[PDB]
Amino acid sequence: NQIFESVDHYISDLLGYEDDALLAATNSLAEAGMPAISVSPNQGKFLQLLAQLCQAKNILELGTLAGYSTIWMARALPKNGRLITLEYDPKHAAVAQKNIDRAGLTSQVQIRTGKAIDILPQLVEEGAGPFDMIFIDADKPPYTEYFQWALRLSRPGTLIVADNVIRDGKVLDENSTEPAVQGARRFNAMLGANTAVDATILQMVGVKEYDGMALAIVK
Amino acid sequence: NQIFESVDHYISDLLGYEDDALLAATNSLAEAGMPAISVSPNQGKFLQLLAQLCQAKNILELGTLAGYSTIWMARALPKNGRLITLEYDPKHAAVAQKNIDRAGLTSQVQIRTGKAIDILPQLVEEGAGPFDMIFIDADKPPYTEYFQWALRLSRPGTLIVADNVIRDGKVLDENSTEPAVQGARRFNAMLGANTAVDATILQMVGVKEYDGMALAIVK
Ligand SMILES: C[S@@+](CC[C@H](N)C(=O)[O-])C[C@H]1O[C@@H](n2cnc3c(N)ncnc32)[C@H](O)[C@@H]1O
Numbered sequence: 001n002q003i004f005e006s007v008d009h010y011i012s013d014l015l016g017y018e019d020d021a022l023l024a025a026t027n028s029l030a031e032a033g034m035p036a037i038s039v040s041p042n043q044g045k046f047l048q049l050l051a052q053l054c055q056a057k058n059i060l061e062l063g064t065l066a067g068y069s070t071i072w073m074a075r076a077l078p079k080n081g082r083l084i085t086l087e088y089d090p091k092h093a094a095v096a097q098k099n100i101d102r103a104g105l106t107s108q109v110q111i112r113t114g115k116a117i118d119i120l121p122q123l124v125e126e127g128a129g130p131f132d133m134i135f136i137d138a139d140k141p142p143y144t145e146y147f148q149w150a151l152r153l154s155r156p157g158t159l160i161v162a163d164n165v166i167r168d169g170k171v172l173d174e175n176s177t178e179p180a181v182q183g184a185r186r187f188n189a190m191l192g193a194n195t196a197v198d199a200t201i202l203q204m205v206g207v208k209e210y211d212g213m214a215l216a217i218v219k
Numbered sequence: 220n221q222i223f224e225s226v227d228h229y230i231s232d233l234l235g236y237e238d239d240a241l242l243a244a245t246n247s248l249a250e251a252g253m254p255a256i257s258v259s260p261n262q263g264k265f266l267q268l269l270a271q272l273c274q275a276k277n278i279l280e281l282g283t284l285a286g287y288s289t290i291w292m293a294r295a296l297p298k299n300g301r302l303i304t305l306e307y308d309p310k311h312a313a314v315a316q317k318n319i320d321r322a323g324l325t326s327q328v329q330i331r332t333g334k335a336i337d338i339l340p341q342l343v344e345e346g347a348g349p350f351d352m353i354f355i356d357a358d359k360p361p362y363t364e365y366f367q368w369a370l371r372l373s374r375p376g377t378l379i380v381a382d383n384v385i386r387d388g389k390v391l392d393e394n395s396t397e398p399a400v401q402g403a404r405r406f407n408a409m410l411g412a413n414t415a416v417d418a419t420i421l422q423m424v425g426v427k428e429y430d431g432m433a434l435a436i437v438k
């Protein structure tokens with residue numbers, strides 16, 4: 001509906017200003033032929049406020065892409081803050097590195113290349129925890145496992161965020177055989193049953209297709 | 220669309236459970252003949268999570284109605300925490316006191332009958348500040364006035380939340396001669412220009428009418 005899309009343009013004119021480093025991140029995608037599957041500016045700004053609400057010095061991010069979301073969330077850090085973002089795709093990492101450097105965030109942001117399910121143990125072992133805020137936005141089937149690792153890297157009051165868990169409302173189809181819809185359905189049922197967190201899911205609308213974000217805080 | 224309604228039901232099945240005190244507070248609408256406003260269960264849960272992120276011990280709320288939103292947020296507080304809510308209409312404020320007494324929140328929540336524009340000063344004057352989280356959901360024309368007062372009642376890192384700042388998308392009508400629309404537009408431009416906060420507006424869909432919720436952290 002034009003109304004969701006028009007209202008999103010209205011919100012970002014007032015409160016979703018994109019500076020050059022962010023415009024560059026978006027354009028890096030077409031240049032490197034990467035998929036246009038980043039958060040929107042308004043989601044970007046939302047992630048920034050939540051980070052500020054956790055008084056974030058330490059942020060964990062699964063799924064860098066060109067580092068659009070990374071720039072928004074790293075800008076909530078104070079001078080001596082740290083964001084560690086995980087990326088399977090070395091092309092994606094290398095582009096995210098240029099985009100982070102163009103933003104003057106080289107000293108605050110570290111990109112680890114490799115599978116999330118291999119890097120997460122290495123973050124436990126090397127005691128890089130606890131994180132103030134953790135953004136999960138990678139492949140969907142192992143969402144339930146990424147969250148277990150998330151908890152293992154949390155402190156009481158850590159905000160965990162998991163994006164695209166509604167999937168245009170396809171999670172209503174018990175009979176859907178898409179790995180992503182089945183990953184989200186497992187994750188949503190797991191959240192619902194999890195006693196280590198209090199949580200909800202936000203329904204989001206705008207220029208980006210009908211989206212669902214999970215928010216969970218660690219007790 | 221029915222997709223939103225169904226997805227809201229999915230989410231509240233999993234994460235939006237309402238106990239006696241919340242369904243009683245809903246019903247107390249019909250039994251005192253007040254309007255079917257109040258947040259959804261899912262907005263209730265979202266507001267509860269925001270209060271815990273803010274580590275809330277003292278919460279301020281404008282517009283009590285039947286205390287539905289009050290009970291949700293109240294339940295984020297320690298035993299040693301307080302919530303003041305301001306209600307224009309004496310009927311509403313008396314009903315609220317029942318539904319809140321029923322929830323066992325009698326000694327954690329103070330209701331105050333009056334126009335918000337008069338009490339908000341009394342609270343500055345009584346030194347009831349600062350508040351961890353302020354929830355604004357009263358008349359829409361005075362929203363920018365309520366916000367200025369909220370800044371007075373704040374500390375750095377305070378979450379201010381202003382609900383219904385989109386009005387089903389009528390804020391896109393600069394020719395609107397509706398006071399609530401022109402009130403919400405003025406508030407939205409004011410957030411747009413305010414250097415004392417970082418803010419966004421979330422577009423919200425589900426069982427309640429399409430609305431928007433402003434989120435501002437005080438720097
Ligand atoms: C949704 S995009 C991330 C976009 C980013 N959050 C933003 O808004 O700018 C998904 C990313 O996850 C990465 N990815 C997919 N599977 C992964 C895995 N198993 N481990 C780590 N990264 C993975 C993809 O390579 C891609 O870069």
Ligand SMILES: C[S@@+](CC[C@H](N)C(=O)[O-])C[C@H]1O[C@@H](n2cnc3c(N)ncnc32)[C@H](O)[C@@H]1O
Pocket residue numbers: 256257258281282283284285286287288289305306307308311333334335336356357358
């Ligand atoms: C949207 S309802 C609040 C419901 C609340 N969000 C909940 O879920 O329980 C609006 C309330 O604001 C009250 N109100 C209107 N103008 C007011 C004013 N000037 N000062 C205080 N309360 C006011 C109305 O009487 C009504 O109870």
